[PDB]
Symmetry: C3
Subunit: 231 residues, 3 copies
């Protein structure tokens, strides 16, 4: 395990996701409100899935070698397995907060699936120049998602409770900033142009992942917006 310099960040990531999972699990024990239960379920599952995939990367299972540029390049494929399930759960948290219509939710989840799926294909593609074609398609799917979060959701939040409108606005802003960093790190890291070494890349993704999951969850689950308006 320690044979890879990036192991320290995989281990820290595993620990922080594990701790985040346990914290949300305990916190949600005292919850009976049916609406709050939905948000706790979604939000606890996110770091639990990430915990398993960080562990698989730490132990070496979630790593494969991909030939491109005349080299055997270490590619952590387990990231995409994580993201396939956790990024639509994160979007679902946002969509339920603002009572999004079903068509909009399906558009978001579908675009998200395309985003992660094409990122996976790009990560595993052996023809170097083609990796960036997949990156571009994935990034276009991301831009669609960000567009919807701003010009379909923000003006939906404003007709809702003030506490859900303010909580949505904060989580929207956190999401757009954090999620936009992922394609940049991929592009300059070992999957793309290879300018930033894998150990630093792994650190960067770990900070983004913990912030986008445990950070996000801490903000959401401390808000009164997750509860039905009750006396």
């Amino acid at each position: 395990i320690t044979g890879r310099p990036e192991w320290i960040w995989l281990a820290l990531g595993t620990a922080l996701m594990g701790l985040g999972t346990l914290y949300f699990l305990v916190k949600g024990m005292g919850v009976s409100d049916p609406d709050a239960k939905k948000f706790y379920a979604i939000t606890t599952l996110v770091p639990a899935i990430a915990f398993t995939m960080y562990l698989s990367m730490l132990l070496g299972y979630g790593l494969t070698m991909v030939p491109f540029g005349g080299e055997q390049n270490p590619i952590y494929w387990a990231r995409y397995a994580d993201w396939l399930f956790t990024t639509p759960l994160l979007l679902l948290d946002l969509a339920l907060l603002v009572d999004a219509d079903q068509g909009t939710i399906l558009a978001l989840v579908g675009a998200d699936g395309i985003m992660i799926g094409t990122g996976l294909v790009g990560a595993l593609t052996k023809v170097y120049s083609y990796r960036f074609v997949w990156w571009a398609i994935s990034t276009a799917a991301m831009l669609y998602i960000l567009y919807v979060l701003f010009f379909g959701f923000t003006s939906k939040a404003e007709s809702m409770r003030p506490e859900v409108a303010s909580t949505f606005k904060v989580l929207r802003n956190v999401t757009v900033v954090l999620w936009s960093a992922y394609p940049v790190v991929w592009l300059i890291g070992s999957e793309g142009a290879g300018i930033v070494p894998l150990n630093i890349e792994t650190l960067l993704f770990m900070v983004l992942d913990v912030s986008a999951k445990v950070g996000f969850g801490l903000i959401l689950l401390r808000s009164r917006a997750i509860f039905g308006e009750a006396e």
Copy 2:
């Protein structure tokens, strides 16, 4: 890319799915009705997914070699990845049109999953005679789906709005004819008996795919059946 004679049909397929995706995306921009949004979301996602998988076939990612009959046989596995997601979306379009009950929808999607999954296993099976066992099981799942579309849905459409009944009937008929061709092409093509060469097989699937997705979508999204009855 041009090293494979079937590349021209993969390229045309990619282009037509891409163009179809953009057309539906633009067309649905001016839509606020919650019901119509569902149909636009579902129907736009279908060629978008197909676009990505056609591209993966064009670039060579979605192709593998399978030993059977003492030969290395080129198998485009990306078709099944496409179909796994797009065929239940197509069925969902039909089921929502007639306000199908939840049990019926689950039966359809489940049978569809079995249909595509067993087709994939058959496509990748190395014992030649066993490929046709999987083809038979998949075809039985197809026949179940077609049965339900006729003797569970058609008489559901007739108690609904005339515009939804007439639109459903047309899309049902398009679906049954087009979908029934797929097992025949598989059986006589490079996956099955090998009587029709891969380049012609690829052409045939491209015509079926564009018709079943973009053709289907053009009929559906031009109907007033996708809108709630409103003043």
Copy 3:
């Protein structure tokens, strides 16, 4: 096929799932009640999926070799493909019976996904001692599911119809006993410590699978709890 001593149990399993599938399919033909249709759909799909995966194991497709302990160890990976889809369907049968809230259903299905997914990783892991780390995480996800079935569902059933409360209690008890045997068989069988040989392991899983699917389904589909209260 007969080259593997466990083939007889794979063949019997295939037959019993096939027969169970046909029986439930015929039985549900005379059903119009929308609630009952849901239970028939879910419950018929379960042995149908299991039939396909038992067949893939019989024909040899669903088997791979995994190096650990200095040996090539036969691992039937198709079990996890089965279980990935059938165990959440089984939980859905239980959850719908007691009209579980959406948050609880998502927690169950999510924990179940983690349970099966980590079992799959453990089954395919090449470092022997690490296989048991994945077994432990999977078992913890199982224990969560069993906890919810007892201390979240049982007291939900009691405020419902007596026929649904009594049917739920029986199916809950069947589920907890049968499902708890699976991690034990894995641990002592060819995936784990290797004390029980593969042919006996295969027998054990076949008895558990038929009981947990066809047995379970026979109890559920003969109950009046699956019908809406109607005059």
